[PDB]
Amino acid sequence: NLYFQGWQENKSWNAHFTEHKSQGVVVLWNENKQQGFTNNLKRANQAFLPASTFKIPNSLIALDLGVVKDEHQVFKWDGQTRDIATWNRDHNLITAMKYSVVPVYQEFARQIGEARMSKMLHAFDYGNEDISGNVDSFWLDGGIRISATEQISFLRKLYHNKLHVSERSQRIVKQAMLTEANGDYIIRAKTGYSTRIEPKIGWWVGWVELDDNVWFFAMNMDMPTSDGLGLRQAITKEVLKQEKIIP
Ligand SMILES: *C(=O)[C@@H](NC(=O)/C(=N\OC)c1csc(N)n1)[C@@H]1N=C(C(=O)O)C(=C)CS1
Numbered sequence: 487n488l489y490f491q492g493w494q495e496n497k498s499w500n501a502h503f504t505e506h507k508s509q510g511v512v513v514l515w516n517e518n519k520q521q522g523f524t525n526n527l528k529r530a531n532q533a534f535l536p537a538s539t540f541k542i543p544n545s546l547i548a549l550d551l552g553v554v555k556d557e558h559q560v561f562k563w564d565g566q567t568r569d570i571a572t573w574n575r576d577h578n579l580i581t582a583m584k585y586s587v588v589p590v591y592q593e594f595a596r597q598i599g600e601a602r603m604s605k606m607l608h609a610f611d612y613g614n615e616d617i618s619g620n621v622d623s624f625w626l627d628g629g630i631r632i633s634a635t636e637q638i639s640f641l642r643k644l645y646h647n648k649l650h651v652s653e654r655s656q657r658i659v660k661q662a663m664l665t666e667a668n669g670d671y672i673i674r675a676k677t678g679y680s681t682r683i684e685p686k687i688g689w690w691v692g693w694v695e696l697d698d699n700v701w702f703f704a705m706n707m708d709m710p711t712s713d714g715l716g717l718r719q720a721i722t723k724e725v726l727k728q729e730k731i732i733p
């Protein structure tokens with residue numbers, strides 16, 4: 487039996503969205519205290535397309551099924567020149583995550599297939615578990631939906647190696663999620679940018695590792711133009727600095 491204190495709403499974080507002329511939600515979860523915090527409980531439970539944050543469960547499935555042998559396997563560029571320059575090269579799992587190389591993961595989903603992708607997302611309890619649409623694009627313009635609170639629930643299982651895949655797969659994905667590390671904290675996260683279906687939003691989901699605690703975070707915000715993509719991390723870090731989680 488699970489016991490859960492409700493999400494505590496801290497509307498003071500809205501000032502961080504307001505200062506940057508933005509609208510969105512930040513959700514934090516204190517792992518030690520088992521307490522959750524958000525600036526907008528309604529938007530915290532609102533489900534959106536995961537977009538590139540789906541690279542986290544997609545990596546886990548591709549690794550557990552042998553589609554990706556390890557983080558060193560090179561996926562050669564198919565020769566198609568695309569709009570984002572860093573996509574037009576060879577990649578491994580580490581660089582495909584860092585630069586958010588969609589075509590690499592579309593090939594992953596095709597090899598996984600509809601049957602295994604559906605069964606794996608159900609085992610993950612991931613969002614609405616709906617892969618309706620193209621097998622290689624559902625997370626970009628299909629039926630899958632996930633909320634910021636559901637993202638944190640999925641990430642907590644990943645951190646504790648509790649997802650129903652091999653521990654090795656989860657360790658490799660958590661290594662590929664490495665974003666920032668210094669003497670004060672470690673950040674393992676994944677960005678996201680949904681544009682094929684309104685509303686256009688940006689994601690940032692992950693956790694902050696401290697010496698004594700882990701703070702899980704999941705944010706999304708309105709993103710009418712790609713000019714404010716950096717606000718996904720800037721606003722999240724402003725909330726973390728206000729809560730004295732990072733210096
Ligand atoms: C994943 O989120 C992915 N985003 C996209 O492919 C885009 N739309 O998907 C619905 C996209 C890229 S540019 C545009 N106008 N729409 C990669 N995500 C990120 C990210 O930082 O989140 C990127 C910037 C590279 S594209």
Ligand SMILES: [Cl-]
Pocket residue numbers: 537538540541587588591
């Ligand atoms: Cl993707």
Ligand SMILES: [Cl-]
Pocket residue numbers: 660661664
């Ligand atoms: Cl690491």
